[PDB]
Ligand SMILES: Nc1nc2c(ncn2[C@@H]2O[C@H](COP(=O)(O)OP(=O)(O)O)[C@@H](O)[C@H]2O)c(=O)[nH]1
Ligand SMILES: Nc1nc2c(ncn2[C@@H]2O[C@H](COP(=O)(O)OP(=O)(O)O)[C@@H](O)[C@H]2O)c(=O)[nH]1
Ligand SMILES: [Mg+2]
């Protein structure tokens with residue numbers, strides 16, 4: 001069955017842990033470095049298998065969304081009807097946009113505590129306005145009015161709202177693109193000359209398929225060039241290399257001195273090089289073995305993108321003067337040379353190979 | 367001259383604006399949160415008065431809870447024609463809760479009420495209301511007047527404005543000056559200055575700290591005590607000055623922002639208190655929806671935020687934007703506090719409410 005990665009987000013005390021348990025309980029009855037703190041559960045509807053991540057606190061949601069083990073195919077925003085939207089409601093929607101969470105469904109929780117239908121519609125309208133503020137489609141967003149606690153306790157009218165939520169997961173969250181179905185991309189690691197064959201470049205194929213005879217672009221670091229794949233070897237047992245495989249790709253004519261580590265091989269026109277991008281960055285705390293002191297607009301660390309690192313300079317948002325350990329911030333980075341990147345690409349910030357930060361490319365500038 | 371802060375309270379249309387004008391006129395010839403105020407100053411022979419009046423009920427609620435000046439006394443205006451009305455009662459109760467220490471009554475519109483029995487009946491109702499809220503109803507000065515006929519220059523009614531001013535002068539004591547109260551310093555910055563030791567900085571709120579004096583360190587953690595070994599201004603530090611206080615012994619990790627330095631014994635730490643709270647309206651940039659008993663915002667006391675949980679009054683289920691309510695607050699750790707301490711209610715460092723400590727539990 002199709003595998004979908006989801007997770008709960010929202011303000012502390014709004015009911016993310018309770019909802020996580022209610023979903024597991026009801027679906028079983030009905031259909032039966034950086035420190036990463038997570039709760040992991042799996043559950044099934046008739047057509048799909050879900051892997052669900054919840055986190056204990058705000059800082060953990062920030063780290064999961066920016067560098068967690070699984071990319072969320074969709075998020076369940078939990079909003080308590082009693083408080084309405086709160087600061088981490090807003091912060092988690094914003095972070096969802098910045099890190100590329102593609103869909104959000106809302107579970108309006110604690111509706112057992114709110115008798116007033118006008119009050120429920122008022123909270124729903126505030127949530128849709130907030131979703132639309134951050135470029136989610138607030139008017140089309142599924143909003144389920146429920147009680148995680150009364151569903152976990154076995155009340156039929158509230159268990160029905162959990163079923164309604166799972167029906168929205170199935171209908172509203174599409175399966176992501178499989179890596180094998182995306183445009184070919186190989187992050188280049190080693191570069192060899194083989195006598196009377198030519199230049200071989202190695203790496204693990206990230207996306208797609210490369211076949212003997214296909215044109216490839218060499219993208220990043222230096223101006224983009226093009227060549228032809230004249231052979232493909234797979235490391236561990238017509239010729240081709242597939243997403244997830246370690247391969248050696250033989251190139252026509254390209255010399256050792258015309259291709260390097262940290263460039264990519266890609267389907268021509270599928271990916272572009274950039275120096276300048278907006279990002280969301282988590283700065284490691286002192287307890288995670290990161291920086292002890294804040295940094296300012298001058299800071300010049302190394303950015304680690306796939307198989308290489310590149311120096312760059314940062315700009316901070318309007319009215320922000322410094323960035324403290326453990327903070328997350330929007331920063332505009334200018335790398336000393338271009339790197340192949342799309343929105344959603346993860347990177348590390350390092351100081352002599354101590355990790356000090358984790359980022360996601362939010363928006364490419366020019 | 368001694369400076370005294372006063373103001374008018376009472377029900378819409380009972381004559382607070384008219385009385386404000388009448389006092390000014392007769393004394394001259396004789397001698398975020400949206401803050402809406404009318405400010406006038408007037409003098410008696412011995413005292414200078416700064417007087418605040420407000421246009422609407424919601425403005426009087428905001429002035430009492432978060433106004434720039436603590437009232438030393440309030441003039442309650444009651445129309446003899448209506449008697450006490452809902453905002454009469456609400457302002458007296460709020461006055462008790464925010465610690466307004468004296469109320470004088472101006473029974474207004476007596477130009478419209480020819481019947482002495484009826485005037486005595488309104489006076490008895492006002493005295494009973496004041497006593498219901500622990501003001502001294504039986505001994506409260508009550509002046510029978512007409513703000514309008516005084517403002518229009520009728521001598522019989524101008525004389526009652528003079529009677530009201532003589533009551534301001536005799537009934538309202540001057541407040542304690544901050545310089546004469548026990549030393550209190552809200553702690554902001556904490557430095558280690560090797561060769562001297564730990565300096566704590568802030569603006570002296572009350573009193574004087576002198577080199578060699580013992581201070582208590584109050585709030586957040588269990589109370590500790592040490593000695594002042596130095597005072598720098600940015601021998602002593604006085605109320606209103608920015609200072610750095612050097613401490614005997616204390617390490618940078620044994621003192622923190624949000625604690626206070628105090629005269630020992632003068633202030634105690636508490637988690638639990640009753641408060642009067644004004645919740646900002648949507649138009650003031652506050653909350654859009656009501657909150658219920660589970661709400662857990664931050665409470666800003668002097669120099670620091672502290673998370674807390676709330677209990678509402680019996681039979682209150684929710685609090686709307688723009689409402690003012692009595693709430694019981696339980697903070698996650700103690701804060702040095704007395705009755706009358708103001709605080710902010712914040713969401714993500716953004717202000718959603720203003721309150722005052724009414725009773726320590
Ligand atoms: N009344 C009510 N309480 C709820 C509901 N869901 C959760 N709670 C309570 O709210 C509190 C916080 O829930 P929890 O799931 O731990 O919140 P989290 O911080 O978002 O994970 C717990 O006491 C829950 O029992 C609900 O639907 N109705
Ligand atoms: N007859 C009479 N009318 C008065 C007196 N004092 C005020 N008024 C009138 O009552 C109305 C309300 O007065 P105002 O001072 O604006 O009331 P506020 O809402 O309490 O500020 C106005 O029409 C005044 O002229 C008074 O002593 N006698
Ligand atoms: Mg939880």
Ligand SMILES: [Mg+2]
Pocket residue numbers: 382383384420421
């Ligand atoms: Mg008025």
